[PDB]
């Protein structure tokens, strides 16, 4: 019979480890039994590999799910197709297949470091937590890699085993590391997960400035008030001078500013009148934010501290906002929204304002006819109130306006979905907070009588629930799989085949069925007191990790710890954006969160860590741990997590606070580092919390490592002690001029004695040497790739200057197995379909082929990217063949242009010379290009370009004829593969004469050096010698100066010249520069330089492409009385192994490598000069 028969829905995505569940519904016109088969196909390269299959039989009137088996996590980005085929017992019913979008996120990985800021020579304690999508533990093998900001692999662990998902590890930082954002990269299966943590020095300011202003402001206010509070670290007020600069941020107009200079004693209040910010609307006209900067300078020290803030300006007396409104119009269905009105200064609204009515105007327009209605509305003390009104069925666009005492606001809805029957259904919820496991209600409202609704719940791009509801009222119980956001899609059919549906996107609060509770023995405890921390876990055989850290981590509001916010962020990262299709309303409401439907029904400050506990409980649901409160006096905060096999993950509901406090103590705001021989100020704050002011004697213990200048009251020891009076419930500061006289970690001990109580604190101070820092670096390549030799000895030496600061010398030696190449994904991003004109084609083509060559010579290929790039440059070769002329010339538009370009001809000639090993290139084309390029040869060997390059970045590359000649010969050098008879000796002599004349520009010199080095001219060695004399080497960083990018091209050509002359060891600093010109932006800027840089790197890889490495590097000599041994193999080839050597003048070492392959050894010397 005619009418609806079936409706099957599926999610549009595919996720490894995600269960592809499809929903099936058969309503009236189906047969008794229908067998639905779901198939997953991996069609790639015309290989329709059917991977996963499922089948299920369903009855009439049954709304059910068919679940495919989970895809394994080892899968990668492949073209995946889902086929659904519903059949009867004797005939087909439907069969269709579609594409599925691939999501790379399959599992959750948390990196939990104890803090986000680390000093040098501190211990980074971290935890790796691997979890399934459903938060069960995930046992797997993984690699951990800790790298410095310069991306040197400084530490690694390989093939670590996750015991119930938790891997607790430590990493000891060096004494003098590279300050910046260190990275922890965890490799699981084939995916990488990152976590950045910063390393820096304290550098404390002695006073801090806080600028209290209202965030929002209006012109009508007479007094725009604000406060500046400059306060010391110990609470004493600061006397000084403040300069206040008020500047509008209207950058279109002038940058005129208001300057106010006056004095401050701790705190000072300022007020602005209306005549000062008039110019803000005279410079430009709605008012935007304005920047207020305060510069506070102390009168006695002159230390200037600058603090900036932004203040928004509002054009109205009050500000009005709307929320809880549907973005799509639903006619004939009461519209509801919520309005909040608040004051311009941000203060609470007055009772007087509550008496005034808000005028709300609604305009429903059929965009023929329109209806404008007004409604009086009230406002509560909080200001939040709901507004409700019906929508006329003919409304096509709604405009809402709110007015209140001159304060205006407005909004509009233009989106509309067309129902031929004019039937709509609104889905709503009353629960403002939805949790997992707690049932929540749901409302459906409709202008017509409703049938038995069918509801389906989707989350994480997976259809997680289905069912049928007979009422217009129903409650649902969310589960863990529903989080973080859930689409509830309700629908029902009509007799004419119309399908009427509605969505509701609800956030779901997550609560774990596994629970952890921490209890302190005492809420308040004295320092150095034994305190028992009790942990309670719901289920035994659980692994727990507890972190107890200072409260300044919460003050930072940015940390690496496993908090509820981090889990929510991971869950929102699990989510994906919706996909656009064929735009029809009944399909669009389904596509709102990516559901693909088939049916017939459509016809017609520095923190410190205390506890890093990690315990694998065996049989106990609770345990106790006796710990010691540190001497630091603070409010420790403890949190933790539990992982169990059955329940999964559980988190502490709240942190637990232990206030380590005593009523009388000592504080030192010591600096991170001081310079020896300098008289620095030591401030000691004696804090007293007794009920009486106390006379306290502060004693500084004498030591040989440092001295105290001013004598003390006693004569037995000079500068030994002072005495002061500390007020009750207050801190008193005392000063001491201390001159260090020793390097390294000096102890400083301070003892406060009073009749009531006493205390003593000992601390470390890192005293460094004075002078100006200097660094020297020398690299050497030990090349045991050749099997003829098996040992290689080198000598690295350096002599310190006579004026070196004694004790400031540090000698490091590092060994590495390979240089740092670009990341594979970063280069893969540059692969693209070459389109546009000939120049755009070449721009989008050349990086692809050069990256392919570099990857081939590095042996890190992936088949899918290989075939993608092969198809891409095959199409690019065809497109360039379309742009090839009859004479072999090439141009952007081919024959449309009047004359081809010899420079572009040489570029494309080099391109096919590079492409010849990868595809078949017609040799007649190559000979045509060769003849056309030879036709431009003059008697003296110089060349000339008749063409013109449209693109400026290619046209702008040193248009002088010398570079043109160098480019054509450096393109023609590769024609020796097919035949070596290339007569360019006259051109080589011309270039030699030009070099003899002396060349000023760096890039011309680089191309010259490459040209004469390729042909083995005798002058090429000398040219390279005066090229590297022009190089600028400072601290193992070699590059070249620019005339005004060009630097990369000169560097790459110099590196290629170095390789061609077998001076491989000298190119290492240039290579490091090439390695440091990619980490800043991923790949390489532009496209002209990427080709030469990747060519140089590929040539380097090819020169020592041995796949096996077993090198042992022994460092001996006067600086190394013990032989320092490094082992380099295929596992730790990238590991920047390091060692420290003793100080001896001259500093010289033998480095003897034995084995097979190649290694790079670098000696670094850091010292200080006077």
Ligand X SMILES: *[C@@H]1O[C@H](CO)[C@@H](O)[C@H](O)[C@H]1NC(C)=O
Strand ranges across the sheet with 318-323: 318-323, 335-343, 384-389
User: Between β-strands 524-525 and 656-660, what pairing exists: parallel, antiparallel or unpaired?
Assistant: parallel
Residue 509 C-beta: closest distance to ligand X, Å? 21
Instruction: Determine the interface stretch with ligand X among 107-115, 212-220, 385-393, 426-434 (rule: CB under 6 A).
Output: 385-393
Residue 1044 C-beta: closest distance to ligand X, Å? 44
* Choice between 964 and 1115, CB closer to ligand X: 1115
Instruction: Determine the interface stretch with ligand X among 181-189, 388-396, 927-935, 967-975 (rule: CB under 6 A).
Output: 388-396
Please give the backbone phi and psi of residue 457, each rounded to the nearest 5 degrees, phi first.
-115, 130
What x/- string results for residues 345 through 374 when contact with ligand X is judged by CB under 6 A?
Answer: ------------x-x---------------
Residue 98 C-beta: closest distance to ligand X, Å? 7
* Subset of residues 317 to 336 that bind ligand X, contact rule: CB under 6 A: 334
* Choice between 96 and 996, CB closer to ligand X: 96
Residue 17 C-beta: closest distance to ligand X, Å? 6
State both tokens at 687. 């804090």
Residue 48 C-beta: closest distance to ligand X, Å? 17
* Subset of residues 858 to 887 that bind ligand X, contact rule: CB under 6 A: none
Q: How many CB atoms lie within 10 A of CB 1079?
A: 14
* Choice between 37 and 702, CB closer to ligand X: 37
Residue 21 C-beta: closest distance to ligand X, Å? 8
Residue 594 C-beta: closest distance to ligand X, Å? 15
What x/- string results for residues 489 through 528 when contact with ligand X is judged by CB under 6 A?
Answer: ----------------------------------------
How many whole angstroms separate alpha carbon 898 and alpha carbon 506?
63
What x/- string results for residues 1137 through 1156 when contact with ligand X is judged by CB under 6 A?
Answer: -----------x-x------
* Choice between 238 and 360, CB closer to ligand X: 360
What x/- string results for residues 70 through 99 when contact with ligand X is judged by CB under 6 A?
Answer: x------------------------xx---
How many whole angstroms separate alpha carbon 1066 and alpha carbon 779?
8
Minimal CA–CA distance to 790: which of 1160, 1157, 1065, 1161?
A: 1157
Instruction: Indicate the burial class of 1163 (C-beta count within 10 angstroms; 0-12, 13-18, 19 or more).
Output: buried
Residue 1121 C-beta: closest distance to ligand X, Å? 12
- Cβ-contact 70, 17 below 8 angstroms: yes
| Crossing angle of helices 985-997 and 1019-1029, rounded to 10° | 40
Instruction: Determine the interface stretch with ligand X among 257-265, 296-304, 384-392, 504-512 (rule: CB under 6 A).
Output: 384-392
896-918 b/e with 16+ CB inside 10 Å = b? ebeebbbbbbbbbbbbbbbbeeb
Residue 581 C-beta: closest distance to ligand X, Å? 9
How many whole angstroms separate alpha carbon 721 and alpha carbon 734?
11
Return the residue nearest ligand X (CB atom). Answer: 96
Minimal CA–CA distance to 1116: which of 713, 796, 651, 641?
A: 796
Local structure of 937: helix, strand or coil: coil
- Cβ-contact 1067, 1039 below 8 angstroms: no
- Cβ-contact 25, 55 below 8 angstroms: no
Calculate the CA 28 to chain-centre distance.
Answer: 53
* Choice between 95 and 654, CB closer to ligand X: 95
Residue 711 interacting with ligand X (CB under 6 A): no
Instruction: Determine the interface stretch with ligand X among 259-267, 382-390, 662-670, 819-827 (rule: CB under 6 A).
Output: 382-390
* Choice between 446 and 957, CB closer to ligand X: 446
Tell which one of 72, 205, 346, 390 touches ligand X (CB under 6 A). 390
Tell which one of 157, 322, 389, 417 touches ligand X (CB under 6 A). 389
- Cβ-contact 797, 1148 below 8 angstroms: yes
What x/- string results for residues 13 through 32 when contact with ligand X is judged by CB under 6 A?
Answer: ------x-------------
Tell which one of 378, 421, 795, 1145 touches ligand X (CB under 6 A). 795
State both tokens at 722. 């002072």
Residue 461 C-beta: closest distance to ligand X, Å? 13
Please give the backbone phi and psi of residue 1027, each rounded to the nearest 5 degrees, phi first.
-75, -45
| Crossing angle of helices 1068-1076 and 1088-1103, rounded to 10° | 130
113 CB-near residues (< 8 Å, 6+ apart): 124, 125, 126, 127, 184, 195, 197, 560, 561
Tell which one of 650, 1117, 1155, 1157 touches ligand X (CB under 6 A). 1117
* Subset of residues 938 to 977 that bind ligand X, contact rule: CB under 6 A: none
* Choice between 1082 and 1118, CB closer to ligand X: 1118
Minimal CA–CA distance to 708: which of 734, 682, 683, 739?
A: 739
Count of residues near ligand X by CB under 6 A = 18
Tell which one of 48, 49, 53, 67 touches ligand X (CB under 6 A). 67
How many whole angstroms separate alpha carbon 680 and alpha carbon 667?
17
Minimal CA–CA distance to 666: which of 789, 754, 589, 599?
A: 754
Residue 1121 interacting with ligand X (CB under 6 A): no
597-618 b/e with 16+ CB inside 10 Å = b? bbbebeeeeebbbbbbbebebe
Residue 376 interacting with ligand X (CB under 6 A): yes
Residue 334 C-beta: closest distance to ligand X, Å? 4
- Cβ-contact 1168, 804 below 8 angstroms: yes
* Choice between 68 and 1136, CB closer to ligand X: 68
Interface residue list for ligand X (CB under 6 A): 19, 67, 70, 95-96, 133-134, 334, 357, 359, 376, 388-390, 795, 1117, 1148, 1150
């Amino acid at each position: 019979a005619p009418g609806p028969r079936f409706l099957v829905t599926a999610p549009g995505i595919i996720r490894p480890g995600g269960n592809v569940t499809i929903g099936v519904e058969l309503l009236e016109h189906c047969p008794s039994q229908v067998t639905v088969k779901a198939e997953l196909l991996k069609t790639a390269s015309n290989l329709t590999v059917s991977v996963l299959e499922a089948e299920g039989v369903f009855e009439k009137g049954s709304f059910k799910t068919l679940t495919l088996p989970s895809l394994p996590l080892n899968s990668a980005d492949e073209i995946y197709e889902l086929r659904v085929t519903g059949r009867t017992q004797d005939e087909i019913l439907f069969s269709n297949s579609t594409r599925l979008s691939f999501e790379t996120k399959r599992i959750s990985v948390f990196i939990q470091t104890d803090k986000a800021l680390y000093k040098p020579k501190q211990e980074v304690k971290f935890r790796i937590v691997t979890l399934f999508s459903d938060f069960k533990p995930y046992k797997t093998s993984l690699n951990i890699l800790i790298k410095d900001p310069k991306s040197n692999l400084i530490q690694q662990w390989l093939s670590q085993q996750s015991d119930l998902g938790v891997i607790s590890k430590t990493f000891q930082l060096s004494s003098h590391p590279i300050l910046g954002d260190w990275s922890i990269q965890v490799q699981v299966n084939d995916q990488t997960y990152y976590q950045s943590f910063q390393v820096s020095e304290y550098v404390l300011p002695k006073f801090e400035v806080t600028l209290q202003t209202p965030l929002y402001c209006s012109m009508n206010s007479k007094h725009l008030n604000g406060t500046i509070t400059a306060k010391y670290t110990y609470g004493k007020p600061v006397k000084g001078d403040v300069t206040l600069t008020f500047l509008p941020l209207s950058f279109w107009g002038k940058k005129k500013n208001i300057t106010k200079t006056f004095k401050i004693n701790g705190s000072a209040n300022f007020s602005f009148n209306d005549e000062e910010m008039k110019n803000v609307m005279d410079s430009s006209s709605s008012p935007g934010p304005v920047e207020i900067l305060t510069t506070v300078t102390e009168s006695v020290t002159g230390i200037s501290r600058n603090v900036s803030t932004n203040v928004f300006f509002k054009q109205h007396d009050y500000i009005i906002e709307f929320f809880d409104y549907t973005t799509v119009l639903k006619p004939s269905l009461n519209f509801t929204a919520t309005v909040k009105v608040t004051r311009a200064d941000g203060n609470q609204l007055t009772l007087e304002e509550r008496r005034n009515n808000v005028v709300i105007t609604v305009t429903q327009r059929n965009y023929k006819m329109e209806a404008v209605q007004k409604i009086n509305y009230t406002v509560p003390q909080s200001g939040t109130f709901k507004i409700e009104f019906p929508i006329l069925e003919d409304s096509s666009e709604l405009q809402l306006k709110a007015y209140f005492l001159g304060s205006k606001s407005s909004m509009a809805v233009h989106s509309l979905f067309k129902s031929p029957s004019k039937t709509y259904i609104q889905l709503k919820t009353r629960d403002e907070n939805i949790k997992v496991g707690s049932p929540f209600e749901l409302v459906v409202s409709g202008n017509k009588r409703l049938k038995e609704l069918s509801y389906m719940v989707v989350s994480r791009g997976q259809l997680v629930a289905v069912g049928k509801q007979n009422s217009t009222m129903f409650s649902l119980t969310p589960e863990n799989s529903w989080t973080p956001k859930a689409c509830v899609i309700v629908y029902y059919i009509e007799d004419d085949g119309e399908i009427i549906s509605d969505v509701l996107k609800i956030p779901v609060q997550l609560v774990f069925k596994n629970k952890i509770k921490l209890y302190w023995s005492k809420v308040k405890a004295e320092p150095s007191e034994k305190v028992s921390l009790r942990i309670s876990v719901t289920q035994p055989d659980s692994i727990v990790g507890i972190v107890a850290v200072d409260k300044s981590v919460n003050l930072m509001n940015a940390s690496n710890d496993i908090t509820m916010e981090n889990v929510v962020h991971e869950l929102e990262l699990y989510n994906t954006g919706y996909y656009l299709g064929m735009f029809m309303n009944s399909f669009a409401v389904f596509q709102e969160c990516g559901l693909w439907v088939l049916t017939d029904a459509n016809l017609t400050h520095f923190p410190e860590t205390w506890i890093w506990l990690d315990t694998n409980m065996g049989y106990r649901i609770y345990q106790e741990f006796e710990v010691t409160v540190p001497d630091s006096i603070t409010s420790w905060v403890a949190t933790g997590f539990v992982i169990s096999e059955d329940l999964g993950l559980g988190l502490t509901t709240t942190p637990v606070e232990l206030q380590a406090f005593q009523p009388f103590f000592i504080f030192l705001n010591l600096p991170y580092s001081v310079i020896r021989g300098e008289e620095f100020a030591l401030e000691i704050t004696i804090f007293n919390y007794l009920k009486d002011a106390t006379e306290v004697k502060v004693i500084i213990e004498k030591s040989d490592k440092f001295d105290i200048l001013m004598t003390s009251n006693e004569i037995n020891a000079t500068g030994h002690q002072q005495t002061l009076l500390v007020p009750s419930e207050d801190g008193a500061t005392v000063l001491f001029p201390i001159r260090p006289t020793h390097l390294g970690e000096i102890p400083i001990t301070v003892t406060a004695l009073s009749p009531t109580a006493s205390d003593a604190v000992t601390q470390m101070i890192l005293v460094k040497a004075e002078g100006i820092e200097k660094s020297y670096s020398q690299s050497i390549l030990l090349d045991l790739t050749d099997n003829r030799l098996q040992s290689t000895l080198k000598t690295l030496s350096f002599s310190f200057p006579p004026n070196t600061v004694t004790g400031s010398e540090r000698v490091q030696i590092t060994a590495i197995g390979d240089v740092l190449g670009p990341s594979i994904n970063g280069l893969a991003s540059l692969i693209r379909m070459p389109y546009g004109c000939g120049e755009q084609n070449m721009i989008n083509f050349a990086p692809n082929i050069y990256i392919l060559d570099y990857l081939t010579k590095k042996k890190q290929l992936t088949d899918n990217l290989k075939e993608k790039a092969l198809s891409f440059m095959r199409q690019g070769y065809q497109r360039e063949l379309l742009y090839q002329r009859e004479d072999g010339s090439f141009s952007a538009f081919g024959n449309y242009d009047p004359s081809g370009s010899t420079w572009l001809s040489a570029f494309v000639l080099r391109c096919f010379l590079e492409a010849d090993p990868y595809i078949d290139i017609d040799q007649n084309v190559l000979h045509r290009t060769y003849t056309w390029l030879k036709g431009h040869q003059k008697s003296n060997g110089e060349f000339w370009d008749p063409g013109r390059v449209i693109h400026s970045e290619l046209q702008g590359g040193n248009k002088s004829p010398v570079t043109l000649t160098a480019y054509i010969v450096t393109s023609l050098l590769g024609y020796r593969k097919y035949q070596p008879n290339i007569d360019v000796q006259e051109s080589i002599h011309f270039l030699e004469s030009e070099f003899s004349r002396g060349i000023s520009d760096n890039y011309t010199l680089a191309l010259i050096t490459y040209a004469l080095s390729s042909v083995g001219s005798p002058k090429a060695k000398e040219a390279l010698n005066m090229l590297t004399w022009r190089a600028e080497q400072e601290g193992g960083m070699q590059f070249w100066v620019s005339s005004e990018s060009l630097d990369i091209e000169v560097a790459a050509y110099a590196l290629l010249s170095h390789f061609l002359q077998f001076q491989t060891s000298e190119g290492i600093p240039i290579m490091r520069w090439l390695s440091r010109q990619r980490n800043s932006l991923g790949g390489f800027a532009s496209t002209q330089d990427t080709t030469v840089a990747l060519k140089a790197l590929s040539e380097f890889a090819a020169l020592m492409n041995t796949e096996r490495t077993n090198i042992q590097v022994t460092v001996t000599g006067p600086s190394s009385p013990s032989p320092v041994k490094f082992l380099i193999d295929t596992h730790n080839r990238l590991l920047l192994q390091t060692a420290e050597l003793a100080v001896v003048q001259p500093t010289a070492v033998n480095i003897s490598a034995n084995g097979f392959g190649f290694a790079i050894c670098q000696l670094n010397v850091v010292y200080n000069v006077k």
